[PDB]
Amino acid sequence: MRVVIQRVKGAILSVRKENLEIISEIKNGLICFLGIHKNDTWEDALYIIRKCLNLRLWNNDNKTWDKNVKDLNYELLIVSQFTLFGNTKKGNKPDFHLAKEPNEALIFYNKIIDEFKKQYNDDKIKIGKFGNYMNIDVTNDGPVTIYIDTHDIN
Amino acid sequence: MRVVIQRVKGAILSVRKELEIISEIKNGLICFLGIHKNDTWEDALYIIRKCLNLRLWNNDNKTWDKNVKDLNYELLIVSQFTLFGNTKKGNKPDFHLAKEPNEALIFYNKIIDEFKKQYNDDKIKIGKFGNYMNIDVTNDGPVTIYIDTHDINL
Ligand SMILES: Nc1ncnc2c1ncn2[C@@H]1O[C@H](CO)[C@@H](NC(=O)[C@H](N)Cc2ccc(O)cc2)[C@H]1O
Ligand SMILES: Nc1ncnc2c1ncn2[C@@H]1O[C@H](CO)[C@@H](NC(=O)[C@H](N)Cc2ccc(O)cc2)[C@H]1O
């Protein structure tokens, strides 16, 4: 599993209504762009969940890297992104072969979302719209960008 | 050397003087660039070639088909040491892998110069290295790409 975590003052997420309208909004918090690998297991997901929730990305009391999202009662917007498995190693056109197929990915993603809300709180976890074109107006704070690939630890 | 490339409709970059705008792009890419203490010129040339050549926009009916240069779009290069934020140990990132600020700035300035030489002086915008930045961004897709050059054989 791969995640890019960005620290924000706000994020406004919107989709097409045409078959843009705002479907989700956060203030202070994190936006987490999350890629599900075809071989991901529950263990991968748990590690990402723990890290997003516990990473000390805010300053407190004139001390750096001190507080996490839960501490400050901040929000998280979770956005599904298969582009992180974009192989850029060959030429100009990225391929996305490492990504989990969208049907499996969706149920996996929903499970992750539920697990997020379980360790924190239902009101503090916002999502986008798996499989849909999205527009996200984001106020980047710092900016602070953290990358994690689970294929590198335990 | 590490980079997070995001596809944008626009990005407005602001620093504390309260917030003065120093830099603005419409359509293009924002690149969050982290320089590693052992990075060579070759690592840079690989990132530059990729930000410039990767086919990240669709083109009516065709998917992942056009790059930033094809479309005559812009690039906002933003210096980011948080990409060397190691989060494997505790929950406080450490940044020992990141090249020291003055050497980093010198290297970053060269990188900007080579971007301009490979594309166009007018099309490459930057942040304020070493400074707190606020970045109002409109993510388009979203599309997020991560590259680490120590994962490939130059
Ligand atoms: N493996 C996956 N991990 C995370 N999200 C996934 C994965 N597979 C599918 N998705 C979801 O399905 C969408 C389109 O396939 C994924 N969407 C995206 O990555 C962005 N909306 C960008 C995008 C850009 C172009 C395009 O043709 C499709 C999507 C994600 O919401
Ligand atoms: N090795 C480096 N690679 C890229 N940028 C670097 C590097 N070293 C220093 N910088 C620049 O100097 C700042 C502090 O080191 C870096 N700033 C940032 O990464 C963002 N403003 C995030 C931030 C936010 C707060 C803070 O106290 C430090 C950093 C970067 O612009």
Residue numbers in the entry:
A (entry chain A): 1 to 19, 27 to 161
B (entry chain B): 1 to 17, 26 to 162
Describing publication, verbatim:
However, a freestanding enzyme D-aminoacyl-tRNA deacylase (DTD) removes D-amino acids (D-aas) mischarged on tRNAs and ensures that D-aas do not get incorporated into proteins. Mechanistically, the most remarkable challenge that DTD faces is to specifically act on multiple D-aa-tRNAs while rejecting L-aminoacyl-tRNAs (L-aa-tRNAs) without any specificity for either the amino acid or the tRNA. The enzyme is a symmetric dimer with two active sites per dimer that are located at the dimeric interface.
The ester linkage between amino acid and adenosine is replaced by an amide linkage to make it non-hydrolyzable. Crystal forms I and II have two and eight copies per asymmetric unit, respectively. The lack of recognition of side chain atoms indicates that residues with different side chain chemistries and sizes are treated alike. Such a side chain-free recognition mechanism provides the basis for how nature has designed a single deacylase to deal with any D-aa-tRNA and reveals the crucial role played by weak hydrogen bonds in D-chirality selection.
